[PDB]
Design a protein around this motif. Structure first.
Motif, PDB file in Angstrom:
ATOM      1  N   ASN A  59      41.070  41.994  43.493  1.00 46.67           N
ATOM      2  CA  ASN A  59      41.392  41.897  42.070  1.00 46.67           C
ATOM      3  C   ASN A  59      42.819  42.410  41.888  1.00 46.67           C
ATOM      4  OD1 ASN A  59      41.816  42.441  39.364  1.00 46.67           O
ATOM      5  ND2 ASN A  59      39.655  42.981  39.019  1.00 46.67           N
ATOM      6  N   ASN A  60      43.743  41.536  41.548  1.00 44.07           N
ATOM      7  CA  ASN A  60      45.185  41.994  41.476  1.00 44.07           C
ATOM      8  C   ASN A  60      45.640  42.317  40.056  1.00 44.07           C
ATOM      9  OD1 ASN A  60      45.605  39.532  40.301  1.00 44.07           O
ATOM     10  ND2 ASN A  60      46.359  38.538  42.168  1.00 44.07           N
ATOM     11  N   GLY A  61      44.682  42.405  39.130  1.00 39.33           N
ATOM     12  CA  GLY A  61      44.948  42.783  37.745  1.00 39.33           C
ATOM     13  C   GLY A  61      45.306  41.599  36.869  1.00 39.33           C
ATOM     14  N   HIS A  62      45.386  40.404  37.468  1.00 34.14           N
ATOM     15  CA  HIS A  62      45.575  39.199  36.620  1.00 34.14           C
ATOM     16  C   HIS A  62      44.608  38.065  37.015  1.00 34.14           C
ATOM     17  CE1 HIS A  62      49.007  39.034  39.565  1.00 34.14           C
ATOM     18  NE2 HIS A  62      48.598  37.780  39.742  1.00 34.14           N
ATOM     19  N   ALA A  63      44.029  38.106  38.219  1.00 34.42           N
ATOM     20  CA  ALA A  63      43.025  37.180  38.631  1.00 34.42           C
ATOM     21  C   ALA A  63      42.335  37.800  39.848  1.00 34.42           C
ATOM     22  CB  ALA A  63      43.641  35.789  38.994  1.00 34.42           C
ATOM     23  N   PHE A  64      41.457  37.085  40.561  1.00 36.36           N
ATOM     24  CA  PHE A  64      41.067  37.551  41.877  1.00 36.36           C
ATOM     25  C   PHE A  64      41.487  36.535  42.919  1.00 36.36           C
ATOM     26  CE2 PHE A  64      37.314  35.388  40.148  1.00 36.36           C
ATOM     27  CZ  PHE A  64      36.943  34.514  41.139  1.00 36.36           C
ATOM     28  N   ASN A  65      42.053  36.986  44.027  1.00 35.98           N
ATOM     29  CA  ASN A  65      42.494  36.030  45.048  1.00 35.98           C
ATOM     30  C   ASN A  65      41.555  36.124  46.250  1.00 35.98           C
ATOM     31  OD1 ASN A  65      44.732  35.621  43.542  1.00 35.98           O
ATOM     32  ND2 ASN A  65      46.232  36.511  45.004  1.00 35.98           N
ATOM     33  N   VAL A  66      41.193  34.995  46.817  1.00 36.38           N
ATOM     34  CA  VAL A  66      40.518  35.005  48.140  1.00 36.38           C
ATOM     35  C   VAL A  66      41.642  34.708  49.119  1.00 36.38           C
ATOM     36  CG1 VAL A  66      38.865  33.995  49.662  1.00 36.38           C
ATOM     37  CG2 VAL A  66      38.339  34.364  47.275  1.00 36.38           C
ATOM     38  N   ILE A  89      47.109  29.941  52.014  1.00 37.72           N
ATOM     39  CA  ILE A  89      47.253  31.391  52.006  1.00 37.72           C
ATOM     40  C   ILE A  89      46.204  32.072  51.092  1.00 37.72           C
ATOM     41  CG2 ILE A  89      49.198  31.231  50.332  1.00 37.72           C
ATOM     42  CD1 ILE A  89      50.190  33.924  51.659  1.00 37.72           C
ATOM     43  N   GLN A  90      45.942  31.500  49.883  1.00 39.23           N
ATOM     44  CA  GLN A  90      44.945  32.172  49.006  1.00 39.23           C
ATOM     45  C   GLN A  90      44.459  31.114  48.000  1.00 39.23           C
ATOM     46  OE1 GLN A  90      45.738  32.556  45.467  1.00 39.23           O
ATOM     47  NE2 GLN A  90      47.858  33.280  45.330  1.00 39.23           N
ATOM     48  N   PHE A  91      43.264  31.326  47.476  1.00 41.00           N
ATOM     49  CA  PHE A  91      42.934  30.631  46.207  1.00 41.00           C
ATOM     50  C   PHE A  91      42.546  31.612  45.135  1.00 41.00           C
ATOM     51  CE2 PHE A  91      38.632  30.286  48.236  1.00 41.00           C
ATOM     52  CZ  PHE A  91      37.841  30.873  47.243  1.00 41.00           C
TER      53      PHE A  91
HETATM   54 NA    NA Z   1      49.518  36.501  43.345  1.00 43.23          NA
END
Ligand code: NA
Ligand SMILES: [Zn+2]
Length: 258
Positions: A59-66, A89-91
């Motif tokens: 959780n990066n404070g604006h969305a969650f990245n896998v 790299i991520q979704f």
């Molecule tokens: Na990002």
């Protein structure tokens, strides 16, 4: 970070710290289906995700990245409008507080409940940080979500959201197969654009799929329980983390289909 999606730090404020917000090739945009040009020279997309290695969910404070291991050509996107090989790299997703909003792109002004972005970088630039400085550095596959039947291949993501409720939390997230998130058809629209969060860099070839996937009301409800804030700070629910459509300016959206 200072920027966010609230009244006082949301997208209409971003240009004061990131003046490129008012640039010529910003995203997202509304896709006008009757003005998009069919381009018979566009190739089918090639999605090779059989050897994907997922690592972590954050959780990066604006969305969650896998996040995926991108140290070798294991999950790549080629073809379509792209030259070269782009590594996943991520979704992440963008979603709304209600089912009638949440997507960043719109199609003839229609908003969907959420939008999935699979982010990939051009391997000719060697790393992601160098790729974001180049006009052809990133390719993002954008997939809309509508609410209807559940998507079984999303359930593994929604079940771990409890463990990363607050910003800065991460969890191990191995053996997740992103093929379970793709619609049946790979027909797409494509245009040159930007990252839709700061730093808003104009380094993205966008490839937006025409066919949405369906997810259940209970699955999207679980996204809405995440928090923008860190642990022990006042609770602010992570909803409406989408930027509104930006002017098309001097760009043409191309379609791979008629
Ligand atoms: Na990002
Ligand atoms: Zn995104």
């Amino acid at each position: 970070h200072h920027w966010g999606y609230g009244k006082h730090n949301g997208p209409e404020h971003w240009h004061k710290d990131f003046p490129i917000a008012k640039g010529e090739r910003q995203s997202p945009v509304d896709i006008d289906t009757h003005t998009a040009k069919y381009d018979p020279s566009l190739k089918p997309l090639s999605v090779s995700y059989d050897q994907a290695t997922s690592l972590r969910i954050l959780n990066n404070g604006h969305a969650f990245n896998v996040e995926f291991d991108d140290s070798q050509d294991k999950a790549v996107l080629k073809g379509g409008p792209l030259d070269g090989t782009y590594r996943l790299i991520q979704f992440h997703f963008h979603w709304g507080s209600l089912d009638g909003q949440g997507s960043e792109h719109t199609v003839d002004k229609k908003k969907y409940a959420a939008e999935l972005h699979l982010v990939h970088w051009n391997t000719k630039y060697g790393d992601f940080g160098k790729a974001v400085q180049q006009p052809d550095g990133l390719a993002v596959l954008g997939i809309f979500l509508k609410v209807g039947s559940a998507k079984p291949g999303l359930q593994k993501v929604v079940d771990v959201l409890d463990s990363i409720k607050t910003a800065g939390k991460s969890a191990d997230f191995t053996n997740f197969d992103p093929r379970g998130l793709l619609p049946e058809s790979l027909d797409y629209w494509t245009y040159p654009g930007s990252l839709t969060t700061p730093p808003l860099l104009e380094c993205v070839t966008w490839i937006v799929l025409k066919e949405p996937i369906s997810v259940s009301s209970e699955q999207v409800l679980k996204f809405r329980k995440l928090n923008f804030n860190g642990e022990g700070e006042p609770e602010e629910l992570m909803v409406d983390n989408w930027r509104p459509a930006q002017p098309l300016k001097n760009r043409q959206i191309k379609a791979s289909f008629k």
